Design a protein around this ligand. Structure first.
Ligand SMILES: CCCCC[C@@H](O)/C=C/C=O
Ligand SMILES: CCCCC[C@@H](O)/C=C/C=O
Ligand SMILES: [Cl-]
Ligand SMILES: [Cl-]
Lengths: 131, 131
């Protein structure tokens, strides 16, 4: 799971607004979230994975074990159940809440970390590179 | 558990260096950790409690359920097991790792949030007030 380890900075964002729309994120947060260029810091300690996201918007962190469901408060303040798994080199996170769910796929593409977020057919894609 | 909810800023620190010494935190981190004036953001969402700590030093966050042990990577990068409990108005956190343990008691005193950290008889006390 070490291919993801390191510090990553956002270099491109696509369709993030309609992904957020689909998730139920409100207008004001969408403006601030869409203007942020977060760093994403990923580390592994033994079996424990950690992902820190650092924007002007918010600073969040999740710590989790692969394939063990955990409770999470997302940056837009949803309380979700998440499970994160490693699937052929992609880190795949499923978040469930209030009868909905969204998949967040983190994968390595050349020198890039590509994050694909899907919910109900709406996809957002954010690309990161090492800082 | 709502007495702790809100944003808190550090107003005083006492004996933090020897507490850190006792925990095993290294010289360089002790300098940077001791110069930080963190904000501490506490929220409750249903049964889920969250504590964000925001310094120039690091931004961390733990999310937990009361009385349910969780794995944590501390700001100084120890992997610990923590259990947090509510004991007569004090939020009490025990961290265990490598045969050691330390207790972090968060309590309300008038308008202050008082954090008392103990390990092997060495105590540190940090006082926060609402930001
Ligand atoms: C701020 C809106 C929350 C929706 C999830 C989105 O942030 C995923 C980002 C990944 O980099
Ligand atoms: C940075 C050293 C980690 C040791 C725990 C100490 O930070 C507790 C602070 C509470 O406010
Ligand atoms: Cl690379
Ligand atoms: Cl008060």
């Amino acid at each position: 799971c070490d291919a993801f380890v390191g510090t990553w900075k956002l270099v491109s964002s696509e369709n993030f607004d309609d992904y957020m729309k689909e998730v139920g994120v409100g207008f004001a947060t969408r403006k601030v979230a869409g203007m942020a260029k977060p760093n994403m810091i990923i580390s592994v300690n033994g079996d424990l994975v950690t992902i820190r996201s650092e924007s002007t918007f918010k600073n969040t962190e999740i710590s989790f074990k692969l394939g063990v469901e955990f409770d999470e408060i997302t940056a837009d303040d949803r309380k979700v159940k998440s499970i994160i798994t490693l699937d052929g080199g992609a880190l795949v996170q499923v978040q469930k809440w209030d009868g909905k769910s969204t998949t967040i796929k983190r994968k390595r593409d050349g020198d890039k970390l590509v994050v694909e977020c899907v919910m109900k057919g709406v996809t957002s894609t954010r690309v990161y590179e090492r800082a």
